[PDB]
Design a protein around this ligand. Structure first.
Ligand SMILES: C[C@@H](COCCC(=O)N1CCN(c2ncc(C(F)(F)F)cn2)CC1)Nc1cn[nH]c(=O)c1C(F)(F)F
Ligand SMILES: C[C@@H](COCCC(=O)N1CCN(c2ncc(C(F)(F)F)cn2)CC1)Nc1cn[nH]c(=O)c1C(F)(F)F
Ligand SMILES: [Cl-]
Ligand SMILES: [Cl-]
Lengths: 183, 183
């Protein structure tokens, strides 16, 4: 089995936090469901990655963000079980990694349906320290002035990031599935 | 459940037919397993599509081919349950459709692993009547001199095709999964 999706009540704090983040940039759309994803196997490897990044950061808390990923309904269960893996599709770019967006409105362009109902993840991402990306990058580049340290993620802007590229699947947990309609 | 994968004995006729087709263009590689995919739901919709194409062809047999598709191991079960759907990834082309290759050696470029073991489908495809494709095509174009008939698939060459683009998932059954190594 591996995972459960728990449908949230729309009057719950947990639902309202996810809804608020979605509604911030897709206010003209209508949310039909929000499910919490429970996959203890994906959460264990995420927490292990986090502990490794925390140690490498002097023992201080790693930069961790909730970021959107628009998908097709048909892969949702595959991602809840196996996580995001950019190697399924490739990219043809800010890096050959999985992409996540700050804005639901940006991830909406990648939620394909042929139907009224669209699906989007809100994922938990250990972005850590980031730098601008490049379409050649297969992993994040070295930090200047360090002989033995690399960035954790690539972005569009360091002063103002809105897209993140993740090269390691253990840096992501697919935390929530959002179903919505555009009318 | 939906599907079973039945591992074939390597001394069976059924295994030798698949192996022969793979070995034709990847003779330097080593096949480790061949599984027959049994999904009665995917086979029913394939046979219904076939009957529709047969009626449209004057009741005569539709052009049907065994064509390769290289994948990652992580989507194999998803395809055995849900079939090929090009809308998972998009294309960025001979058409926005699922691609299949005559030659295993060509599909090998899309079998990603980070391991020794690679995976490839041999799918059953109702290619029907075909015409050259184009990166704009979202479905196959009209037949010249017909007011109410379209092609069934797009290709690279009509006199000599080697790549097929399929826009309708009911035109494909994922019949066999091939695992092989490159050493
Ligand atoms: C510009 C575009 C680039 O996208 C890069 C592709 C990507 O990141 N992928 C695709 C394949 N994937 C996956 N597929 C099936 C499975 C399972 F489980 F079935 F095997 C697992 N993983 C992991 C995610 N950016 C997108 C693309 N899609 N959605 C957005 O939100 C965004 C962006 F940029 F807005 F965040
Ligand atoms: C040039 C390249 C263009 O490929 C076009 C993409 C394509 O056809 N796809 C990708 C996504 N897909 C799928 N993904 C996950 C699922 C599930 F179940 F997880 F949801 C279902 N469907 C259906 C197939 N051509 C390839 C690409 N890959 N392999 C080859 O052999 C070839 C070619 F051309 F050599 F035949
Ligand atoms: Cl990834
Ligand atoms: Cl398709």
């Amino acid at each position: 089995p591996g995972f459960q999706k728990i449908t949230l009540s729309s009057s719950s704090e947990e639902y309202q936090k996810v809804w608020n983040l979605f509604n911030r940039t897709l206010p003209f759309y209508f949310v039909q469901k929000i499910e919490r994803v429970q996959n203890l196997a994906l959460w264990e490897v995420y927490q292990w990655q986090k502990g490794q990044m925390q140690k490498q950061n002097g023992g201080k808390a790693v930069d961790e963000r909730q970021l959107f990923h628009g998908t097709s309904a048909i892969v949702v269960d595959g991602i809840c079980q196996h996580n995001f893996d950019w190697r399924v599709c490739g990219v043809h770019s800010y890096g050959k990694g999985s992409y996540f967006a700050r804005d639901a409105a940006y991830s909406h362009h990648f939620s394909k349906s042929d139907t009224q109902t669209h699906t989007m993840f809100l994922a938990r991402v250990l972005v850590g320290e980031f730098v601008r990306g490049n379409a050649s990058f297969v992993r994040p580049p070295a930090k200047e002035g360090w002989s033995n340290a690399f960035y954790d993620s690539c972005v569009n802007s360091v002063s103002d990031p809105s897209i993140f590229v993740i090269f390691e699947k253990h840096q992501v947990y697919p935390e929530y599935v959002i179903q919505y309609t555009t009318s």
